[PDB]
Design a protein around this ligand. Sequence first.
Ligand code: COA
Ligand code: COA
Lengths: 327, 327
Amino acid sequence: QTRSSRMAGFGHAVPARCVDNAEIEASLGLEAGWIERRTGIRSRYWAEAGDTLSGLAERAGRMALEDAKINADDIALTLLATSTPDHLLPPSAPLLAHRLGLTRSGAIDLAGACSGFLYALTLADGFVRTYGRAVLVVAANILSRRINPAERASAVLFADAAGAVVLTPCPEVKRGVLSADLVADGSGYDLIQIAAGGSSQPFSAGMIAEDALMTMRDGREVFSRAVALMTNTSQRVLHEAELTAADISRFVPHQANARMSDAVCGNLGIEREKTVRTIGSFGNSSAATIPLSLSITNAERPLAGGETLLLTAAGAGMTGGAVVYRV
Amino acid sequence: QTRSSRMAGFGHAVPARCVDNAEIEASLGLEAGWIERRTGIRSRYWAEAGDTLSGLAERAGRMALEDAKINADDIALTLLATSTPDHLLPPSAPLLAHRLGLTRSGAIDLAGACSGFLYALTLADGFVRTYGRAVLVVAANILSRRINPAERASAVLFADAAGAVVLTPCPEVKRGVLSADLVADGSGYDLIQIAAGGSSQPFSAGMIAEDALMTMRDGREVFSRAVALMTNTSQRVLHEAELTAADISRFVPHQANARMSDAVCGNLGIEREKTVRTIGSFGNSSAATIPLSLSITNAERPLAGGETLLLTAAGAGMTGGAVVYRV
Ligand SMILES: CC(C)(COP(=O)(O)OP(=O)(O)OC[C@H]1O[C@@H](n2cnc3c(N)ncnc32)[C@H](O)[C@@H]1OP(=O)(O)O)[C@@H](O)C(=O)NCCC(=O)NCCS
Ligand SMILES: CC(C)(COP(=O)(O)OP(=O)(O)OC[C@H]1O[C@@H](n2cnc3c(N)ncnc32)[C@H](O)[C@@H]1OP(=O)(O)O)[C@@H](O)C(=O)NCCC(=O)NCCS
């Protein structure tokens, strides 16, 4: 009797430190307006001393739970898509569920850079539909602690945020997730990478500091690959839902880079004016950007029944995905 | 038309270094037979220098694909449950799918300690039944590079392995995953932990080497909490599937500790003779244990149609789960 899922509540959260382009442009010896011109970012939020991923996730999640007016017993599963868990062990999701008082909820972390939220959304939808119970989906990242301040290509982009969606079970068809496409291309695995800390190079006393920090080895190759993945996944979820770009009420791409957002919009023939854009104030927080944008646009104009959303993302891996969701 | 998933193929792999109890006992200044008395482990496999998580996972994955006689184009999604990815970024799953030639497969890492494979299995079953496409589920860990060699409670248990299962879409009902129950208990989050490395304490020059390695802070408390979670999840999936333990053909618990496996069997009324037990040769490899045991038990005696499998695990988090699968 459950045939679909709906986004019943939305939330998002950022740390308090607001970091303008001008502060970063000073550190990197760049003139004024350099960052905004090349990325569309004007400011971003960065975590401060102590700030935890789970505490950030918790605030977005609590906001989404309260928005859904759902009792906390109703959450059967908590999916936390993150690249930056509190600890390498255990995963952060069980602590997130505990801090939200979700006493009947399972919990697991998903590592998909971003593409993590779209993967988590798709699998959560399949859970909601298979078991007929609600799932909380949170995406959150503290990328600021992974930024190599000397690497301009990354230092000007990445930001910290959390977004959350509550998925509840629905009895009716031809709504909810109409189509979904999840791709991966490991030929680009080394383009966005942290050298040290996995099992391939465990962290050791006296290792090179920067080996713990993100690097983007070829910013232009990544741009081209990411645009192709978001374009191609979007085109085929549209084809599978039997829609065109003209039927999408709101386009919510991963907020990698405004120039990249524009490129995808062009490739798909989607007006700039239908595209949710939050990178300007929140930067690129990887898997958090799409649920943060959904929280933002829903606050600005509540999502109305019959609206169709197109969500797409691409990330390190490489990974990519798209989802057509109908309110 | 798809109404269930079937485990169409199995695989497992381990590294080449065999570590007898005697070598670790000497290390810890322990009398002979100490480890086997208390854990039932006789030996375990550890990684050698240059071995990689993704390479280990690939060997298990390929054995599972070949056992399934499945064309690589059919794999639409690769789920890698690991705590020990090659790199902190990107996830290891896209590389694994790339090295296995799965050119149509998405890919994402799940981090669930363990419980990771049972979460992976549950969500993949939802994917299979929702989209009608095959999924490769791998669980793999190289815990040895995270072992604190001085900590007796963890150094004698943990091991390296990979296990893999090909889930294919099946038209018929009343088989496959009959019930699943996924739980989390974050009040025990600190019991099994790595201090440094996540976003809470990022890795730094000059930091205490110890902080990069696992610690189990209260083994007795872990033992009780994990036994309870495996017992309680197992009872409720049996109740949901309207089966008794006597209907279960093979019981396949997470291989944490033979004494813990004995305690769960004892609570549930399950014969030692029905329990798959691989911990004696393969140790505790977290999420890899259950699919490794499934591949072992299937090699010894092919899973026959009609057989009913009870799977259960608990882990750091706390996390836990149970699955009833009918062949
Ligand atoms: C566009 C992108 C490169 C972002 O980085 P960026 O803001 O452009 O930063 P860059 O320094 O690389 O931009 C190019 C700049 O370097 C300069 N530059 C680089 N190589 C140069 C060269 N060989 N000669 C001259 N100038 C060069 C460019 O000309 C330009 O600076 P300048 O005009 O002042 O000389 C892109 O990779 C991106 O946005 N990726 C998204 C991050 C991510 O992973 N998101 C997840 C989804 S993809
Ligand atoms: C059983 C468990 C405690 C670890 O295994 P273990 O080898 O039995 O751990 P211990 O070393 O504490 O066993 C008792 C021993 O510790 C010794 N010990 C520990 N602290 C001691 C102390 N303060 N004083 C005296 N002895 C002490 C006991 O005397 C006994 O040692 P001895 O027989 O040589 O004298 C348990 O935590 C476990 O196995 N957990 C599973 C691992 C896991 O996380 N699996 C994933 C699913 S949970």
